[PDB]
Amino acid sequence: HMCDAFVGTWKLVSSENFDDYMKEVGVGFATRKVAGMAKPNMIISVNGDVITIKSESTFKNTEISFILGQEFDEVTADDRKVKSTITLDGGVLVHVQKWDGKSTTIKRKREDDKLVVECVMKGVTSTRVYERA
Numbered sequence: 715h716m717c718d719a720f721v722g723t724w725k726l727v728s729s730e731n732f733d734d735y736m737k738e739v740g741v742g743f744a745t746r747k748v749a750g751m752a753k754p755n756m757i758i759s760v761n762g763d764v765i766t767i768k769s770e771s772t773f774k775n776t777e778i779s780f781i782l783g784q785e786f787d788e789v790t791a792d793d794r795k796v797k798s799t800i801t802l803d804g805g806v807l808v809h810v811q812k813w814d815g816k817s818t819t820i821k822r823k824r825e826d827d828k829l830v831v832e833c834v835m836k837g838v839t840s841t842r843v844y845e846r847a
């Protein structure tokens with residue numbers, strides 16, 4: 715019942731500072747422009763210990779499946795090959811990606827009827843808000 719309030723289908727409704735976050739991460743111009751236009755669906759499901767997070771958009775479709783605390787190799791939408799670990803910390807899903815001596819963290823939290831996604835790269839934070847679809 716660990717992630718019950720995350721399960722479902724969520725649609726992006728607002729984004730702030732995502733271009734700057736992507737710049738900090740090293741995403742190139744053309745990918746930033748097309749990625750930043752996207753209005754993804756985030757689909758979260760759980761089956762036993764396995765959590766699946768899908769992102770569906772006109773830009774890319776991605777899917778990760780994982781067990782909390784158990785590292786996995788991930789190819790990100792911007793084609794980084796990263797080692798990821800996702801944990802639950804105080805009811806927040808915390809997703810750390812490591813590559814090339816760098817690290818970024820994506821936090822997903824339930825707040826009122828929204829799912830709020832905060833992406834941090836060094837001093838740059840972006841906040842993305844999703845609503846139930």
Ligand SMILES: O=c1cc(O)ccn1Cc1ccc(Cl)c(Oc2ccccc2)c1
Binds near residue numbers: 736753771
């Ligand atoms: O998977 C998520 C969901 C978010 O809201 C924010 C970051 N991340 C991770 C993330 C990482 C890099 C890029 Cl380029 C990215 O761009 C998109 C944009 C739209 C659709 C798919 C990928 C999303």
